[PDB]
């Protein structure tokens, strides 16, 4: 009844990982000297990597080890931690609160000043945009462009200085850039203000994404870069070619589903092997941006169709089709944040329709928008409490093919319903 | 298998909305849409694309592979070579057992593929760099010592074999008789197991120089990476055991 | 079959060598298992130097049901927040009992 494992002991210098074959139906206190003899005042125990060490009286079969696992050699966990005793109470205040990192230091001040600068940039943008669009005065665009130039010059100057203030500063620097680049040729808030703000957002995103020194601020840059490029091209289509009454969001949801489903070749297009641990994360970072834009434009068109009244019922088919397409594409992606954005597409859709109704002066489907959000939160709760409907292992073998067939027949073949929305073949 | 349904649906919604099909005003659109539905359905235009690719092409260190040679082989060592898809914390991407019938010596080869992005953390714990090749050496020698323990003689090789000259590739739809069949002066079969060896899924490739129930590789890359030293996945969908 | 004594996690004994030349001291553990047909399988060790990364992979679990609970709790907080917000933006503008 011998079982073969591979043990990992790394305490002295580096580590040793060796395969071996331990005779099972023996208590672990007998075969721990064998492992310590091969691979090596505290006793040790075999611990499966991802868990807690084992009771030494329990054997390897009745503890859940399959043939070929990887087990580390850890300590028999702990005991009593010898607790401290003080009887004066002011001494109890000064002793028992030390282990906190309560130290103020000259490293909380840097986080405070960087957060103060980010708050100043954001609230200066908010104040001067509310100064520009509520009254009429070009002091607003002047001050927004001034703080935007100030934060861009402060962003590009600390690229090789602190490298975390720079990246977060460049993320918060594309709110004042987008607010400055939506005020030229004022009009009545217009069509091409969106175009110029999109060009500025995509320009800053593409100059700071490839110019980024490291991670932690890559995925939001490629997300807003694909968002800026997509709404830039659709604003170009809506500014020059056709008047484009209800079909801005039509091209937007088409571009969102195109960016979502053809994301493997796209994500590969944005891409000694020492810095291979970097690149794959960066590669996965780009995926966690791009699907986000594949949600965001997928939101940013679906909020355009059914914002007002008098739309088509086929628009109410195509927004549910966009929701099912961007939610049923979750199982084909492996990582966590990709699945999170794909499952949260419909959540952002419900909140976006609710806020578009509450600006849209309806308040009759806004309660129903909250009802749809309650339905989604309810199915989230049911799939979260008992893991049955969220686990596809307890399903059927042709049911998977039928569900995937329905998905690829709804997200791809919504283009006749798109031709019914635009009237593309009433021409 | 996605966009062709979209173009066919756009064409048939370009077709039916010409219900006055008279005097060639939208009857022209009717004719070109019924002609464009029947021509895009993708096996005649991927015939075009495959022609472009195969006449175009006529002029890494991310995946690595270690192959071993076993002379007196059989499927009787089949579990101990299918279980190594994921154990000892290394997650081998595919294991391939290829057999040569050039004469009477059905020469058998076992190739193990280890990626560098499916076990990035496991290889990054070895050193500060990524020693992928040495780790593939260690996994190959572990399979060598295990198979020499269990009975059948194996030897680590590095000039391993040639199933193409490094000549007719076919693939069967899985399962035991159709490989018992597999002519001319070269005969080759190849199984490839992958995907979570508790519930493993296997792909099949073969070569002679259609037989019963096989299908040719019409458009050659399947012979190009059929050498077990190569780093590929033996294109074709895997079957449920 | 060919059974022989083996130390724990070790190769079985060469059958024609005694228990004194093999190095078994009084107070060992032996198990009766079969002789492997071939080499002694020298159990090649591969060195590691940064093994704490491996634990950094395993405690960093996948999607599973654990992220479903975090998503569900976040959806509940967001629903309660916007259910306050829509309702108060209604009642500030114009509001009946609904």
Swiss-Prot record, chain A:
Annotated membrane topology: Multi-pass membrane protein
Subcellular location: Cell inner membrane
Cited InterPro entries: T7SS_EccD, YukD-like
Keyword presence, Cell membrane: yes
Gene null: resulting phenotype: Deletion of the gene impairs iron-bound mycobactin utilization and EsxG and EsxH export.
Positions of transmembrane segments: 109-129, 138-158, 163-183, 189-209, 218-238, 241-261, 289-309, 310-330, 340-360, 365-385, 409-427
Cellular component, GO annotation: plasma membrane
Keyword list, A-Z: Cell inner membrane, Cell membrane, Membrane, Transmembrane, Transmembrane helix, Transport
Family per record: Belongs to the EccD/Snm4 family.
Function (record text): Part of the ESX-3 specialized secretion system, which is required for siderophore-mediated iron acquisition and for the secretion of EsxH and EsxG.
NCBIfam families: T7SS_EccD (TIGR03920)
Record's subunit section: Part of the ESX-3 / type VII secretion system (T7SS), which is composed of cytosolic and membrane components. The ESX-3 membrane complex is composed of EccB3, EccC3, EccD3 and EccE3.
Protein name: ESX-3 secretion system protein EccD3
Source species: Mycolicibacterium smegmatis (strain ATCC 700084 / mc(2)155)
Gene: eccD3
From Swiss-Prot, chain B:
Record carries keyword Lipoprotein: no
Disulfide bonds: none
GO CC annotation, single: plasma membrane
Membrane topology: Multi-pass membrane protein
Subcellular location field: Cell inner membrane
Keyword hit for Membrane: yes
Keywords: Cell inner membrane, Cell membrane, Membrane, Transmembrane, Transmembrane helix, Transport
Pfam families, A to Z: EccE
InterPro entries: EccE_dom, T7SS_EccE
Transmembrane segments: 5-25, 29-44
Subunit and partners: Part of the ESX-3 / type VII secretion system (T7SS), which is composed of cytosolic and membrane components. The ESX-3 membrane complex is composed of EccB3, EccC3, EccD3 and EccE3.
Family of this protein: Belongs to the EccE family.
Function: Part of the ESX-3 specialized secretion system, which is required for siderophore-mediated iron acquisition and for the secretion of EsxH and EsxG.
Protein's UniProt name: ESX-3 secretion system protein EccE3
Organism: Mycolicibacterium smegmatis (strain ATCC 700084 / mc(2)155)
From Swiss-Prot, chain C:
Annotated TM spans: 68-88
Phenotype of gene-disrupted mutants: Deletion of the gene impairs iron-bound mycobactin utilization and EsxG and EsxH export.
Highest taxon of the lineage: Bacteria
Subcellular location: Cell inner membrane
Quaternary state and interactors: Part of the ESX-3 / type VII secretion system (T7SS), which is composed of cytosolic and membrane components. The ESX-3 membrane complex is composed of EccB3, EccC3, EccD3 and EccE3.
Function recorded in the entry: Part of the ESX-3 specialized secretion system, which is required for siderophore-mediated iron acquisition and for the secretion of EsxH and EsxG.
Family: Belongs to the EccD/Snm4 family.
Protein's name in the database: ESX-3 secretion system protein EccD3
Range of the intact protein held here: 65 to 162 of 475
């Amino acid at each position: 009844p011998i079982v073969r494992v591979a043990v990992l002991a790394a305490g002295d210098d580096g580590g040793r990982l060796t395969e071996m074959a331990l005779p099972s139906e023996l208590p672990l206190r007998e075969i721990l000297p064998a492992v310590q003899r091969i691979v090596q005042p505290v006793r040790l125990s075999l611990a499966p990597i991802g868990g807690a060490p084992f009771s030494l009286d329990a054997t390897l079969d009745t503890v859940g080890v399959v043939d070929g696992d990887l087990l580390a050699l850890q300590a028999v966990p702990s005991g009593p931690p010898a607790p401290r005793i003080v009887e004066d109470i002011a001494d109890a205040a000064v002793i028992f609160s030390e282990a906190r990192r309560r130290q103020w230091g000259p490293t909380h001040i840097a986080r405070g000043a960087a957060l103060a600068l980010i708050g100043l940039i954001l609230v200066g943008t908010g104040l001067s945009v509310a100064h520009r669009v509520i009254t009429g005065d070009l002091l607003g665009q002047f001050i927004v462009s001034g703080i935007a130039l100030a934060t861009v010059i402060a962003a590009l100057a600390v690229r090789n200085r602190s490298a975390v203030l720079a990246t977060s500063l460049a993320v918060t620097a594309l709110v004042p850039v987008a607010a400055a680049f939506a005020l030229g040729v004022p009009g009545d808030f217009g069509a091409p203000n969106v175009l110029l703000a999109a060009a500025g957002v995509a320009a800053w995103s593409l100059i700071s994404m490839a110019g980024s020194p490291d991670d932690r601020g890559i995925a939001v840059f490629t997300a807003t870069a694909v968002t800026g490029v997509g709404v830039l091209l659709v604003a170009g289509a809506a500014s020059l070619w056709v008047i484009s009454s209800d079909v801005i969001g039509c091209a937007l949801v088409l571009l969102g589903l195109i960016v979502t489903v053809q994301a493997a070749q796209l994500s590969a297009m944005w891409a000694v092997l020492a810095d291979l641990p970097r690149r794959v994360r960066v590669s996965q970072a780009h995926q966690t941006g791009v699907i986000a834009a594949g949600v965001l434009l997928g939101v940013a068109g679906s909020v355009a169709l059914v914002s007002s009244a008098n739309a088509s019922p086929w628009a109410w088919y195509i927004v549910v089709a966009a929701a099912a397409g961007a939610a049923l594409r979750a199982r084909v992606w492996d990582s966590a944040a990709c699945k999170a954005w794909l499952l949260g597409h419909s959540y952002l859709l419900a909140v976006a329709l609710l806020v578009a109704f509450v600006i849209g002066d309806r308040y009759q489907a806004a309660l129903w928008a909250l009802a749809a959000l309650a339905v989604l939160v309810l199915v989230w709760i049911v799939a979260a409490l008992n893991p049955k409907i969220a686990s596809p292992d307890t399903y059927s073998l042709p049911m998977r093919r039928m569900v995937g067939f329905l998905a690829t027949g709804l997200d791809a073949s919504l283009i006749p319903v798109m031709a019914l929305l635009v009237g593309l073949f009433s021409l | 298998m996605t966009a062709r349904i979209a173009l066919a649906s756009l064409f048939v919604v370009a077709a039916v909305l010409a219900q006055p099909w008279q005097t060639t005003t939208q009857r022209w659109v009717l004719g070109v849409s019924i002609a464009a539905v029947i021509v895009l359905l993708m096996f005649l235009t991927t015939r075009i694309g495959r022609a472009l690719a195969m006449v175009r092409r006529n002029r890494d260190a991310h995946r690595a592979t270690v192959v071993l040679r076993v002379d007196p082989a059989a499927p009787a060592q089949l579990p101990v070579v299918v279980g190594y898809l994921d154990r000892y914390g290394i997650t081998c991407d595919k294991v391939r057992i290829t057999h040569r019938d050039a004469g009477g010596t059905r020469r058998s080869w076992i190739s193990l593929t280890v990626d560098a992005v499916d076990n990035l953390a496991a290889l990054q714990a070895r050193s500060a760099r990524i020693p992928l090749q040495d780790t593939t050496e260690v996994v190959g020698r572990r399979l060598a010592d295990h198979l020499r323990e269990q009975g059948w003689t194996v030897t680590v090789v590095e000039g391993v074999d040639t199933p193409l000259p490094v000549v007719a590739a076919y693939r069967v739809k899985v399962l035991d008789e159709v490989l018992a069949e597999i002519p001319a002066e070269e005969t080759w079969t190849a199984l490839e197991f992958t995907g979570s060896p508790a519930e493993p899924l296997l792909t099949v490739c073969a070569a002679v120089r259609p037989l019963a129930g096989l299908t040719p590789a019409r458009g050659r890359p399947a012979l190009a990476a059929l050498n077990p030293l190569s780093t590929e996945r033996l294109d074709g969908t895997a079957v449920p055991l």
